[PDB]
Amino acid sequence: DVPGFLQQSQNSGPGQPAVWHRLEELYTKKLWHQLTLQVLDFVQDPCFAQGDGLIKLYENFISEFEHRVNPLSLVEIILHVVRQMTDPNVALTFLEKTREKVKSSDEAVILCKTAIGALKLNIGDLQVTKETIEDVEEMLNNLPGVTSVHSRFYDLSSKYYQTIGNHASYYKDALRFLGCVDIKDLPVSEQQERAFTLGLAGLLGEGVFNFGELLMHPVLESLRNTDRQWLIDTLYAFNSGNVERFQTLKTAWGQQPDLAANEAQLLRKIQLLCLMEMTFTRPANHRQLTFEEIAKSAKITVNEVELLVMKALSVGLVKGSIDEVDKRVHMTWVQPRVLDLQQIKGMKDRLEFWCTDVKSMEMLVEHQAHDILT
Amino acid sequence: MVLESTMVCVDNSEYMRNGDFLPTRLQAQQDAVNIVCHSKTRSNPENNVGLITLANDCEVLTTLTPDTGRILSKLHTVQPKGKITFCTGIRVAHLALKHRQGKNHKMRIIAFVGSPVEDNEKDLVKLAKRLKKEKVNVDIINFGEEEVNTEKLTAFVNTLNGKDGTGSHLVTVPPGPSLADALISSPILAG
Amino acid sequence: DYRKKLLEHKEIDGRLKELREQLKELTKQYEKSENDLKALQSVGQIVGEVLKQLTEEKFIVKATNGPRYVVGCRRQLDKSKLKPGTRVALDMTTLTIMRYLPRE
Amino acid sequence: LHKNDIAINELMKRYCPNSVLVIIDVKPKDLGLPTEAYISVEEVHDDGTPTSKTFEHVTSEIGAEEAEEVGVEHLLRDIKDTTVGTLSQRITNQV
Amino acid sequence: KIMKSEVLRVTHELQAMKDKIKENSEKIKVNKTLPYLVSNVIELLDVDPQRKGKCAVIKTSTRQTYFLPVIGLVDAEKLKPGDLVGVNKDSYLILETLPTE
Would the CB atoms of A29 and B17 count as touching at under 8 Å? Predict the structure, then answer.
C-alpha cells in the first residue's frame, strides 16, 4: 500500500501538491515525526474540507500503525475528522478505538475522555457527560499542570456553562482560564466575546462577593479597551462600590436578557459592597457607625436594615454584632481582597508608627534597664 | 593501563524510533555502550562510567563506577520523552567529573546525539571554548540527520579540538543499514 | 505468513508472562523477612503491677521478682488503664510504660 | 531558596517519600530560629496560576532527647537553666 | 512484545532482590547463632486499642519475668505455652522454639 499510496498522494488538487511535495518527500524518507508535523501543517491549513476526507482515512491508518508519535496529534486530526463529518454515531467508535489503540505509555486518556465528553456535550446527553467531566478532573491531580488539557477542560466547563445550571463553577474555572492564558496569540476578535461573556459570567456568578480579582488581573482590562467601555465602567463600579444607583441602574437595564430575575439578587450582592467598603473605610477613631449611612448608601428604609445586616451576617463575610439599643452599626472583620493604595500608604504609616513606638519603648525601658539589671 | 573516566549522554527523544533507520537504534547504541564498556573493562577494568540523558531534566542514571552489571539494568527504562538539551547536557558531565574517586583517571566524555542541536553558534563557541579551556577529551557522536550533519558542527569541533597531536576525534556517521557499533569502533576511541 | 505470527507472539508473550509469578509471590515473603527483622528490634521490656497511686502521674509498681519501684507516665497513653488494679509492663530504661499487662 | 531547589528537591521527592526541606544559615548571626521546615507540597492557587511545588512553613522546635542535653550542658557551662524569678524572666523582658 | 519488554526491568529488580537478600539473610545466622538459655513461654494475646495487640508472657529458668510481643519468624507450631525456646542475652526475644519431651 506504500507504492499504492503514490498514486493518490501524487494525484491531488490544484494547490495541495505543494504540500504533497514535502508530504511525499517526508513520506519516502519514512521520518514519522516530520511526516507527523506535515500532517499538523495540513490540518492546520484551512483546507476546503472537500478532498481531505480520503487522507483522513489514510493518515488515520498510517497514524494507527505508526506506533511512534504522541497520539494527541491523532486526537486533534480525528477531532477534525468528526468536525468535517458530523457523525457522532461513528465518533464514539473512533474514540473508543483510539482508547483501545492508545496503550498506557503516556496518559492521554484525560484528553481522550475530554474529547469524548466534549462531543457528548451535544443535546443528546448532559448529566453523564458532566459526570465523566468530573471524572476528567478526578483522574490526574499529578504533576501535569500543563493546563492545555485543563484549558480544554475549561472548554468542557464552558459547554457546561451552555447549561444554565451553574454560573459559579464556570467562573471558578474561569479564574483558572484567567490564569492559564499565555499571551494574546489566541484571537482578540475572539477575546472580545471571551471577555464579554467572561464579564457577564463574572457578574452572574452568584457564589462571589468581589469582582476585584477579575479586574485586578491586567490581561482582561488590556483586552477590554478594544471593547466598548460601558462594561469596564460598571465592573469598576461593582468593584469600587456604587455610591450611585443611576449608573448601576443604566447598566442594570443596559443588559437586556435574563437580568430581571437575577437583578434583585444582584442588588442583594451590591448592597453588601457598600457595607464592606464603609467598614474598610475608617480604620480607627470611632469604628462604631450607624444605619443612616448604610440606608443613605442603599436608599432603603430603616425597617429593612435589620434584614440587610442579617443578610450580611448570613453571607459570613462579616462577624460584627452590634450591642446597641438605640440603633447603631458596630463592625468587626471583613476581607479587603481587592487593592487600596491609600491603605498601602496608611499601612506603611501605622506600620512604621508601630515600629518606632515599639523601638521607642524598647530603648526606653532598656536604657535604664540594662544599666541596673543586665 | 588506561586510567580515565567515561561519560555518555544518550538521546531519549522520539527521533530514535523512526522507521527509516535501525529498528529502535536506541537498542543498537545501547549495545554499543555494552561493547565499549566491556571493551574498556577488558582494557582497564577499573574505569568508571556514569550514565545520563540529554533531556530537559537530566538525571544521573548511574554514578561513575566500574561495576557495569547494574548499568546494564539502568540502560533499560529509558523513558522516551523530551527532545534535547545541549548546554546543561555538557555542564552536567564536565563539572561532574570533579566528584570522581580516582583523581588520576583522565577526563573523557562522549555524547550520543540523535536530534538536531537547538543551540546557536554563539553558544557553540562558548561551550567549545569552555571545554577546550578545561581540557577534556570530547568525542562527538552524531546519530541521524534532518538537515546536514555537520555544517557549524565542523567548526564547533575544530574550535573545540585543541592538541592536534592525539587529541579528540569527531564521529560523523552517514546513513546506512549497517550498525552504529562497528562504525564507531572504526576510530581509535574504541581500542 | 502474517496471521500466524500474532498468535505465536501471543504464545511468546505467554511464556514470558508465566515466569514472573514464580518470583513476585515469594518476594513478599522475602521482604516480609526483613519486615520481621525490623519487628524484632523492640526488646527489653519488663512487667509490673500497680497497687497505690500517690501522684496521679507517678505511682508505685510491684515487680514479679519482688523489688518495688516508682515509675512515670508515657506521653502517649492516658490515665484510663493507669488506674490501680492494673498489672502493667515496664522498661529497663527510664522505667517507662509502653502498655499494660492484662491478667489471665 | 534558589530556583533549582524544586528540581534538587524532586530527586528526593521521587526516591524518598514527600521530602521536607530545611533552610538554615551559614553564619549563625540571626537572632531568630535558624531552622525552618518547608513542606514540599503542590497547592492549587486562586488566581489560576498553574500548580507548582510550594514550600509552606511547617513550625519547628529544636529538642534534644536525653544525652544530647547532658553533653551540650557539659560543653557549655555558660548557659543557665530555667531559673524563674528575677533574672531569666527579666532578660527576656529586656531584649 | 513491546509492552512485554518492560518485564525485563522487573526481572532485573527481582534478581537484584535475590542479590540483596543474602546480607540481611546472612545476619540471621550470626544473630540466631546460640539460644543461650531455656525460658518458659505463656501465650497471652493482647489488644492495642496497624496497632494490633499481640503478646506473650515469658518466664526465665531463673524465674525472672519480662515483657515482649509475639516475635520471631513465621510461626505455625509455635504460639504454645511451652518451653525450650530461642533467646538472646538481654533482648529476651523468641527465635527458635523446640519441644522439650
Answer: no
